[PDB]
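The following block was generated as part of the benchmark described in Methods. Ligand: sodium ion.
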Amino acid sequence: MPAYACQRPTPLTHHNTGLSEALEILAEAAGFEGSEGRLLTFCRAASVLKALPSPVTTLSQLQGLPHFGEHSSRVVQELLEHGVCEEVERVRRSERYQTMKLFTQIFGVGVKTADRWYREGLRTLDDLREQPQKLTQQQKAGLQHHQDLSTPVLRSDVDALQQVVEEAVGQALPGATVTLTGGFRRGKLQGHDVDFLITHPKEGQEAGLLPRVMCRLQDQGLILYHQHAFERSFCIFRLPQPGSWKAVRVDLVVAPVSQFPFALLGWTGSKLFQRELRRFSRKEKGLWLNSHGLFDPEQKTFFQAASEEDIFRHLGLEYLPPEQRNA
DNA sequence: CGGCGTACG
DNA sequence: CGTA
DNA sequence: GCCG
Ligand SMILES: Nc1ncnc2c1ncn2[C@H]1C[C@H](O)[C@@H](COP(=O)(O)NP(=O)(O)OP(=O)(O)O)O1
Ligand SMILES: [Cl-]
Ligand SMILES: [Cl-]
Ligand SMILES: [Mg+2]
Ligand SMILES: [Mg+2]
Ligand code: NA
């Protein structure tokens, strides 16, 4: 088992679901406390189990696995022995965990805002609604739409949204294309949002595109919320439903075609897969990776890529299709 | 011990 | 600060 | 919390 998640296939469904979910509770709780190092270790240990070919049944099967030391091994041991890990269950029922989870789930609220509200004594969404002077416009929209945004987006919803986006994109710039990214491209059947990447085959023609797209979607009455020159848009869309509609989060990103492979790779995720890939690039290969390119800081040159396959090759990694990037 | 991804709105 |  |  290699030490970086980008060195191994990770399928969406696997053989250690309960164990990985427990470790991910501890990771999440570490994040709520600002302990990014412990969050990473617990996330990485969970991802190792996702990559295994069969269930862990005995503690000895953790020997030699990367990111399993005393703490993660004890969590697994308790689950194998008793079906429950007391530390995990204490986190789950804690007022701190439940409230930080509730607040950070709001669009416009991160850990730092949630923690301040927590320290001020706030505990429920209605506590927040009562004191709207303390809310940004973004947070007001996130709170108004919270119930709909808590409902999974279905793969069956995505095709209708993509057609609507393509219509607006085609008027804004004929020839421009829309690619489905994020978790749906990794094979997820549900999501928290829909992520789309937009480009044009003629380098430079995509400049200034996203404002043109957004004002056309707004004119069609489809935009319940957006922040408005820009290249990323974090929107709330009106999605038709039988006899009604529901609010859905949609992310739009524009990239020039020269950067499209890097943007596709970055926006297809998973989040941990990309952090691990960028960590691998820099620490193992001395190259700096982001959603725009891959930089050699010694030659001061950028690596041209025409495909995701090119990028894996330039990093010395076996290619992984999106379905195997579910770290 | 230092390091832990890297951007844009 | 928020967001991907 | 774990790796190197
Ligand atoms: N902090 C981060 N660092 C690096 N890449 C990140 C990132 N956050 C997101 N990405 C990249 C990788 C992510 O896969 C992609 C989309 O971000 P989401 O839409 O927040 N997450 P997904 O679509 O995977 O699942 P779902 O929406 O169902 O929760 O952007
Ligand atoms: Cl930490
Ligand atoms: Cl980036
Ligand atoms: Mg998504
Ligand atoms: Mg998104
Ligand atoms: Na949030």
